[PDB]
Design a protein around this ligand. Structure first.
Ligand SMILES: Cc1cc2nc3c(=O)[nH]c(=O)nc-3n(C[C@H](O)[C@H](O)[C@H](O)COP(=O)(O)OP(=O)(O)OC[C@H]3O[C@@H](n4cnc5c(N)ncnc54)[C@H](O)[C@@H]3O)c2cc1C
Ligand code: SF4
Ligand code: SF4
Ligand code: SF4
Ligand code: SF4
Ligand SMILES: [Fe+2]
Ligand SMILES: [Fe+2]
Ligand SMILES: [Fe+3]
Ligand SMILES: [Fe+3]
Ligand code: NI
Ligand code: NI
Lengths: 228, 385, 280, 385
C-alpha cells in the first residue's frame, strides 16, 4: 500500500536492475509489499502523484531543461525524497564527464541530485546491492529509523574520491588495515598494499562505497541487535 | 493535422519522446523517435585517459547491457593494442556474454509483460522471469566479478579463472535451468500471439545487421560500409533535430534496424517479419544463448591462463570490437597512442535502431504505435551514452 | 561599454601577407610580428595550427614566418595560456607577448596579480593582446555547423568567420552562411556568464566588429600596448583611421558589448538563485 | 489461344519483342521475352586484338552502363595479366562506378516516369532527375575522362589522378547533392506505390545473384556454378529460338534474375519481392551508391599513383572481372596470350534477366505484362552486344 516512486534522471539504470535482483521478494513485492507509481520505466502515468518516497536513479544535469524542471516538481510530489545509487547520491562516474560529445555537445555538467534539493536519505553503490535496497524498503515500509540512521547521515555525502578514505580515514590514523573497504569496491579499483588500502585512480568511479564500508568511517551498534 | 507526443515513452530504459503525425482516422503518417536523455558523454570522457580505465568507465554507459559494453571496449582496445586472449580467457568472455544475453532478455520480458500478460497470470509470470533471471546472473557475476557492472573483464584477458569447483557449481545451475527457460519462452511465445496486434504491424524495409549470434566478429564489418550522421541532418524538424540527443548511424546510407530479429534472420534464418516477430525473436534468442552458455561451460580448461600480457603504449592504429548486445549489434573502436586513448567511438545497438523506429510507427492507429517502439526494447542510456 | 582605454582606432596591417591570411585587420599578426622586430617580445604564443582540421593547438613562435602560419581565426577552445609556463621555461624568453581571448585574458591578469605558484612568469609577459569574443564553441559543436548546416567537409573551409548577424564559411568556389540564432545552443556552458565582449584586461584589443570588412578595429586598453602600437603606426605597418568617423559606428560595437553584459548578469542571477557556486 | 506480340517493347534501350499466350480473360500463360537487336558482335571483334583495345571497344557495347563495362573489362584483363592497381587507382575506379550507378538509375527513372507520374508533376519530376543526373556525371567524367564512354580507365590503373582542387570541387557537389537525391527517391518511392499494380505482380521463383553492393567481387563467383546456353535450346519455338539474339546464361541450371532488387536482397536484406519491389529497390539502390561516392571521395590519396605497370604478354590463364552494373551483375572473362586476347566473354546484367522476364509476365492481364518487363529496365544493347 505504501507508495514508492523512482525517477531516473540520468542513470546507467543499474540501480533499477538491482531492485529487480531481489527476486524472492520481488514478484510478490510490487504486488503486495509496495505500490509503485510514476515510474516511467515501471509504469506509464506521465504526471506524478504524491508519493511516500521518491527514488532518483541518476545525477541531475544542469543544462538539460527537463531534468532540472522535473527535479523541482519532485520535491513537492514526494513526501520523502531519497536519492539512491551513487549517481544520484555522489554523482558517481558522472563526475568524470567533460561535455562535448555529440549529439548535444553542450551537456557537460552533472551534479548529484542532493546538491540541488535537500534529500532525506541517499544510499550509494553502483548499483546498491540488491539486499540493502530491499532492507531499506522493508525498513521504510516498516517505519524504523534506527536502521536508516546511517543513510540519513549519508545524504550529506556528495563528492567521494577513492582518494578520500585516505584523507578521511587513513590520514586520521583511524585505519587499522582490516581490508573491508577494498572488498567493497564494485570497480575493484581499490587494493591493499601492506597493509593500508592503495587505490588506482584510472579505475575509480567515485562511487563512494569504500568510504561507507570502512568499519572506521561509522560504526552502528544496530547490527549487534540483528545477529543476537 | 494533429501530432501527439508521448514523452518519455514508458517501460524502456532512459527517455525517448515519440512524435506522431496523424490523419483523422488517427493512422500515423510520420513517426519520429528521438532520445531526449542528456548525454552522459562517455565517448569523450574516455579520451586522453588510460586504456585500463576505458573498460570501467564505458560499461557504466549502460547497466543492463554492461557485459556487452565491457566486452566490446576490451576487444576494441585489445585489438588496437594487439593482445591475444588465451583460449580459456576467450572462452570465459563468451560464457559471460551468453549468460548476459539470457539475463538481459528476461529483464525485457519483465518490462513488457504488463501489456502481454493477464493480471491473474502475471504475478506467476513475473516470478518465473525472476527465476530465470536469477540463475543467469550467477554465471555472469561468478565468471566476471560482480555483475551488473562486472569489474573482472580486463584488457587482454580475464582477471581470474573460475575454479573447477566453481565451474561445476555453475554447470548444474545452467543445465538445470534449461527446462525452465524452454518452457518460459513457450509461455511468452504463447502469450504474444494471443494479443494479435494487427498483422503487418511494425514492418519496415530497413536492412538488418548481424555479426554473430552471440559473440560478435569484428571481421564481418565494414568501416567502409559504416557511417554516422548527426540528427541535425536526419530529422525533419529544427526543434526535433535540436532536441534529439542521438547520432544516427547509417549503414550504406540506409537506416538500419539491428536486433535479435535481425540476428536471427542473418544467422538462424527467420523468414517471418513483424513486431510480433521481434517479440518471438527475443524468446528463441535467449533460448539459443543459454545453450552456448552450457556448451562453453562443459568444455572449459579451468586452469589455462586467462590473462595475456600486453604493451599498453600503442600504435596509432585504430581497432574495432563488435559484440552482440541483447538489444542488437554493438561496436567499439579505439585508437591507443602513448598508452592513452586518442579517439573513442561507440555505436550501441539502440543507436542503430532509433532512426528506424520512427518510420516503423506509421500506418496503424497510434495507440498501437508505442507498441511498436516498445517491441524494440530500446535502452536509451545505451543509445545516447 | 568598452573598458577604459587610451584610444580607439580601426586599422589594417600594411603587408600583403598579413592582409592575405589575417582574418580581418591582420593587426594581431602584424602587431605581434612587429614587436619581434622591435624585440619588445622575444616570442609569442599563438593558437593553431592543430592536428585536427581547423583545430587550434597553442604554439609559441619565435619566428615571424611562424606567426604568419598561426594567423587566422579558429573558433574553438585553444588554451593559449597553458603555453605561457612552457614558453618562458624552455625556449627561454625574457619577455613574451601572447594573443589572448578576453576569456584567457581574464585568467592571466589575476595570475600576474596573484601568482600563487607561478614563478617569475608573471613579470615576463610584455604585451598581452585581447581579441573580442562573443562566444566560442567546442570543436564538435563547431563541426556540426560546418556539416549539418553547410554541407561541407571540415577540409574545405579555407576560412571561417562570424559576420555580423551570420556565420560565414569561406570555401574555394563558395561562401556559406547560417544565422546566429541557429548557433544558439552550441557554445560552451562556461561562456554563458562571460561578461566582457571586448578584452578589457588586454593591453591592446582587436576585433572585427565596428570596422569595414578587411579592416580591424584595435582599441588600446593600456599604456604599454599603446606604446607598442604608436611605434608600429610610426613604422607604418598599419593604416589607422579614427574609429568614430568610419561606419559602422563604434557605438554599434558598444551596443554589442552592452548586450553581452545584459546576458551575463541575469545568467548569474539565475545561477545565484540556484545553489551552484558562482565566481563574479 | 491468342498470342500478342509487342515489338519492340517501348522505353527500354535496344529492342526486345515480348510474345504472349493468353486465355480468354487475357491472363497470360507463357511469357516469352527475347532480344531481336542485331548483334554488334563485340565479344568476337575483341579477340586476337590487343589488350589495350579491349576496354575501349567493349564499353561501346553499352553507352548507358559504359563505366561498368569498362571496369569489368579492365578487371578481367588486368586479372589475366595480373597487374595490381595501387589503392588510389583502385579507389578511383570505385568512385567512378558509384557515380555511374547513381546516374544510370536516374536515367531509368526518366524513362519509366511517364507511366508512374502524373503529367502535372512530370515536367517537374523530369527536371529533378536531370538535376540529380547532371551532378553525378560531373564525377564520372571528371574522374574517368569524358563519360559517357569514358576513355580514361585503363589496364592496371587509371590514366591520371584528380587534383586536390578537383577532388574538393567534386566533393561539395556530391555532398550538396545528397539532400536532393534523398528527397528524389522518396517522391519516386511515393509515386510507385500509388500506381498500385496488382500485388503479386512480377513475382518469380528464380534465384537472385549479387557479388557486391557496388563494386563487384570476382572471388564470390563460380565458374563451376555458371553456364551459358544458346536460345535455341531454351526457347519453345523454332521461330522464336531463331529470332532471339541472346544467349541465356544459366546459374546452376536455373534462370536467374540479377538486379538492384537482387543486389539488395543478397547484401542489404530486402525481404519484400515484387515488380513494385524492383522499382522500390532501384531508388534505395542509388541512395546507397551516392553515399559511397562521397565516402570514397573524402578519403582519397590524390597524390598516390593510379597506374601500375604491367606486362601485356600474358599467361594463357583466363581471369574474370565482375562488377555490378546499374542493371545487375556483370562479368568479363579474358585470356591474354601473346599480348592479344584469345578468348573473350561478356555476360551483361540484362543477359541474365531475359530468360527470367518471360516467366515473370504470366498471370496478370497482359496490359500489365509490359509493365513487368519495363520494371527490369533492361538495356538490350548490353544483353546482346
Ligand atoms: C573564439 C573567438 C571568437 C571571436 N569572436 C569575435 C567576434 O565576435 N567579433 C569580432 O570582431 N572578432 C572576434 N574574434 C576575433 C576576430 O574574429 C579576429 O580573429 C581578430 O580579432 C582580428 O585580428 P586579425 O585581423 O589580425 O586576425 P589574425 O591576424 O588572424 O589574428 C588572429 C589571431 O587569433 C589567434 N587565435 C585564433 N584562434 C584562437 C583561439 N581559439 N583562442 C585564442 N586565440 C586564437 C591566433 O593566434 C591568431 O594569431 C574572435 C576570435 C576568437 C578566437
Ligand atoms: S548509480 Fe551506478 S548503476 Fe546507478 S545509474 Fe549511476 S552509474 Fe549507473
Ligand atoms: S576498511 Fe578501512 S581500515 Fe580497514 S583496510 Fe580498508 S581502509 Fe583500511
Ligand atoms: S575505490 Fe572502488 S569503492 Fe572506492 S570510490 Fe573508487 S570505485 Fe568506488
Ligand atoms: S565568450 Fe567569454 S568565456 Fe567564452 S571564449 Fe569568449 S571570452 Fe572566453
Ligand atoms: Fe556513440
Ligand atoms: Fe555475351
Ligand atoms: Fe546495449
Ligand atoms: Fe549494362
Ligand atoms: Ni544498453
Ligand atoms: Ni547496359
Amino acid at each position: 500500500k505504501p507508495r514508492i516512486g523512482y525517477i531516473h534522471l540520468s542513470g546507467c539504470t543499474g540501480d533499477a536492475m538491482s531492485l529487480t535482483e531481489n527476486y524472492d521478494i520481488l514478484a510478490e513485492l510490487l504486488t503486495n509489499m509496495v505500490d509503485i507509481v510514476y515510474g516511467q520505466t515501471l509504469v506509464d502515468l506521465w504526471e506524478m502523484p504524491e508519493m511516500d518516497l521518491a527514488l532518483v536513479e541518476g545525477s541531475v544535469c544542469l543544462q538539460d531543461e527537463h531534468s532540472l524542471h522535473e527535479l523541482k516538481e519532485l520535491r513537492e510530489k514526494a513526501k520523502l525524497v531519497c536519492a539512491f545509487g551513487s549517481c544520484a547520491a555522489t554523482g558517481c562516474f558522472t563526475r568524470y564527464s567533460r561535455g562535448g560529445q555529440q549529439a548535444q555537445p553542450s551537456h557537460e555538467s552533472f551534479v548529484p541530485i542532493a546538491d540541488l534539493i535537500d534529500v532525506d536519505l541517499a544510499l550509494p553503490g553502483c548499483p546498491p546491492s540488491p539486499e540493502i535496497i530491499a532492507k531499506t524498503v522493508v525498513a521504510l515500509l516498516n517505519n524504523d529509523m534506527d536502521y536508516l540512521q546511517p543513510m540519513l547521515d549519508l545524504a550529506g555525502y556528495t563528492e567521494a574520491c577513492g582518494c578520500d578514505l585516505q584523507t578521511k580515514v587513513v590520514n586520521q590514523g583511524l585505519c587499522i588495515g582490516c581490508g573491508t573497504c577494498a572488498m567493497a569496491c564494485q570497480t575493484r579499483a581499490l587494493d591493499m598494499t601492506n597493509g593500508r588500502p592503495e587505490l588506482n585512480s584510472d579505475r575509480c568511479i567515485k562511487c563512494g562505497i569504500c568510504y561507507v564500508q570502512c568499519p572506521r568511517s561509522w560504526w552502528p551498534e544496530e547490527q549487534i541487535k540483528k545477529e543476537l | 493535422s494533429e501530432r501527439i507526443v508521448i514523452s518519455p515513452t514508458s517501460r524502456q530504459e532512459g527517455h525517448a519522446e515519440l512524435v506522431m503525425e496523424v490523419d483523422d482516422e488517427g493512422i500515423v503518417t510520420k513517426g519520429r523517435y528521438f532520445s531526449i536523455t542528456p548525454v552522459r558523454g562517455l565517448e569523450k570522457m574516455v579520451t586522453g585517459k588510460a586504456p585500463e580505465t576505458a573498460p570501467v568507465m564505458v560499461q557504466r554507459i549502460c547497466g543492463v547491457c554492461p557485459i556487452p559494453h565491457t566486452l566490446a571496449s576490451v576487444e576494441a582496445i585489445d585489438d588496437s593494442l594487439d593482445i591475444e586472449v588465451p583460449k580459456a580467457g576467450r572462452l570465459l568472455r563468451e560464457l559471460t556474454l551468453a549468460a548476459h544475453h539470457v539475463n538481459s532478455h528476461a529483464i525485457h520480458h519483465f518490462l513488457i509483460a504488463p501489456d502481454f500478460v493477464p493480471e491473474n497470470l502475471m504475478a506467476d509470470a513475473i516470478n518465473s522471469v525472476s527465476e530465470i533471471r536469477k540463475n543467469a546472473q550467477y554465471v555472469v557475476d561468478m565468471v566476471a566479478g560482480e555483475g551488473i557492472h562486472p569489474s573482472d573483464v580486463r584488457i587482454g584477458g580475464m582477471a581470474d579463472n573460475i575454479t573447477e569447483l566453481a565451474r561445476k557449481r555453475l554447470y548444474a545451475r545452467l543445465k538445470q535451468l534449461k527446462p525452465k527457460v524452454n518452457e518460459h519462452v513457450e509461455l511468452m511465445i504463447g502469450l504474444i500471439e494471443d494479443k494479435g496486434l494487427p498483422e503487418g504491424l511494425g514492418v519496415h524495409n530497413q536492412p538488418t545487421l548481424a555479426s554473430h549470434q552471440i559473440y560478435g566478429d569484428r571481421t564481418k564489418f565494414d568501416l567502409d560500409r559504416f557511417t554516422e550522421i548527426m540528427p541535425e541532418s536526419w530529422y525533419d524538424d529544427p526543434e526535433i533535430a535540436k532536441r534529439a540527443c542521438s547520432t544516427i548511424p547509417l549503414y550504406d546510407g540506409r537506416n538500419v534496424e539491428v536486433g535479435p530479429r535481425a540476428r536471427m534472420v542473418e544467422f538462424q534464418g527467420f523468414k517471418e517479419r513483424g513486431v510480433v516477430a521481434q517479440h518471438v525473436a527475443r524468446a528463441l534468442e535467449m533460448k539459443t544463448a543459454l545453450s552456448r552458455a552450457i556448451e562453453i561451460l562443459d568444455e572449459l580448461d579451468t586452469s589455462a591462463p586467462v590473462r595475456a600480457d600486453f604493451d599498453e603504449r600503442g600504435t596509432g592504429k585504430l581497432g574495432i570490437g563488435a559484440i552482440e548486445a541483447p538489444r542488437g549489434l554493438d561496436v567499439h573502436m579505439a585508437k591507443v597512442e602513448n598508452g592513452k586513448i586518442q579517439f573513442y567511438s561507440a555505436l550501441v545497438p539502440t543507436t542503430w535502431n532509433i532512426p528506424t523506429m520512427g518510420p516503423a510507427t506509421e500506418g496503424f492507429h497510434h495507440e498501437y504505435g508505442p507498441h511498436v517502439i516498445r517491441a524494440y526494447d530500446p535502452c536509451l542510456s545505451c543509445a545516447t551514452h | 561599454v568598452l573598458g577604459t582605454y587610451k584610444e580607439i582606432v580601426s586599422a589594417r596591417s600594411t603587408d600583403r601577407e598579413i592582409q592575405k591570411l589575417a582574418q580581418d585587420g591582420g593587426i594581431v599578426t602584424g602587431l605581434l610580428a612587429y614587436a619581434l622586430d622591435e624585440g619588445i617580445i622575444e616570442g609569442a604564443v599563438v593558437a593553431g595550427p592543430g592536428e585536427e582540421f581547423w583545430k587550434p593547438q597553442p604554439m609559441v613562435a619565435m619566428s615571424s614566418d611562424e606567426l604568419k602560419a598561426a594567423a587566422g581565426t579558429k573558433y574553438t577552445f585553444s588554451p593559449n595560456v597553458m603555453m605561457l609556463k612552457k614558453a618562458v621555461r624552455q625556449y627561454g624568453i625574457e619577455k613574451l607577448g601572447t594573443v589572448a581571448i578576453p576569456c584567457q585574458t581574464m585568467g592571466i591578469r589575476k595570475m600576474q596579480t596573484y601568482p600563487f605558484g607561478v614563478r617569475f612568469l608573471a613579470d615576463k609577459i610584455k604585451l598581452l593582446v585581447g581579441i573580442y569574443c562573443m562566444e566560442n564553441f567546442p570543436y564538435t559543436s563547431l563541426q556540426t555547423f560546418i556539416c549539418e548546416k553547410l554541407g561541407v567537409s571540415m577540409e574545405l573551409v579555407e576560412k571561417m568567420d562570424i559576420g555580423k548577424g551570420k556565420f560565414w564559411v569561406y570555401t574555394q568556389d563558395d561562401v556559406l552562411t547560417l544565422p546566429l540564432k541557429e548557433t544558439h545552443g552550441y557554445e560552451q556552458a562556461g561562456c554563458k556568464i562571460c561578461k566582457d565582449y571586448v578584452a578589457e584586461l588586454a593591453d591592446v584589443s582587436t576585433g572585427s566588429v565596428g570596422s569595414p570588412d578587411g579592416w580591424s578595429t584595435v582599441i588600446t586598453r593600456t599604456d604599454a600596448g599603446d606604446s607598442i602600437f604608436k611605434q608600429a603606426v610610426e613604422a607604418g605597418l598599419f593604416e589607422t583611421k579614427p574609429i568614430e568617423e568610419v561606419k559602422p559606428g563604434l557605438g554599434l560595437l558598444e551596443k554589442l558589448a552592452a548586450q553581452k553584459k545584459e546576458k551575463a548578469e541575469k545568467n548569474i542571477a539565475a545561477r545565484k538563485e540556484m545553489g551552484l557556486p558562482t565566481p563574479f
